[PDB]
Design a protein around this nucleic acid. Structure first.
Length: 175
RNA sequence: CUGAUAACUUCACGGCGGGCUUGAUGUCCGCGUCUACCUGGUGAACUGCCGAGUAGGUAG
């Protein structure tokens, strides 16, 4: 109950929304609040709590074959009665759709926009600091957006970016 | 359009007498049934009042 001051702005792929509510009040990673959400889904007046995920990934509402209709219903009351001033939460969800293209590639709706195929990277992506955080990575071609020369693969020592290993995917002119 | 055409078989009645199936008998020996199993009431018919009362009544 009462997640204090949902702040955020647009242009986000919903994964740092749980990270920004993780860095407040003093909490480790997202396994606690993520269990306390699915515990609250296991609490009063709910029917579909069993399939709400467990890990860093898979908060995505197309990662299950048939919990897609359960994930949005999970995401319905995950904004209303748990936030003062319930924010723009719904619509950030990268869903799936019924549309296709002509070369038989699966269409995928974010809030109004369609990616070419639901394959693009899904793993081992670059990342740049000093925002919170992006909408456009884990895709084929979205690199810099104004400030350039920022690939940031972490061959040197641990904890270069100051976030706390939540999103932080790093392992050890016409563009 | 028939081996064609027609056609009363009827009346009467005592089966009876007698009678010992018997004697004897050993069905026995042996025996591993077992392994694995979800029945599924969400919150849902809630709170008083009189009477000594696990009886009885009485409210919205």
């Amino acid at each position: 109950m009462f997640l204090q001051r949902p702040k955020p702005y647009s242009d986000e792929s919903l994964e740092s929304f749980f990270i920004r509510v993780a860095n407040k009040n003093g909490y480790g990673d997202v396994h606690r609040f993520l269990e306390a959400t699915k515990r609250f889904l296991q609490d009063i007046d709910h029917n579909g709590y069993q399939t709400f995920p467990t890990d860093i990934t898979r908060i995505n509402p197309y990662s299950a074959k048939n919990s897609s209709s359960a994930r949005t219903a999970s995401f319905l009351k995950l904004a209303q009665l748990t936030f003062n001033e319930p924010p723009e939460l719904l619509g950030l969800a990268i869903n799936r759709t019924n549309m296709k293209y002509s070369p038989s590639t699966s269409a995928v709706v974010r809030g109004a926009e369609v990616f070419p195929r639901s394959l693009l990277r899904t793993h081992s992506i670059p990342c740049c600091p000093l925002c919170l955080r992006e909408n456009g990575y884990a895709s084929y071609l979205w690199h810099f957006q104004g400030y350039e020369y920022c690939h940031s693969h972490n061959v040197p020592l641990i904890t270069t970016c100051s976030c706390g290993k939540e999103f932080d995917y790093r392992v050890s002119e016409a563009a």
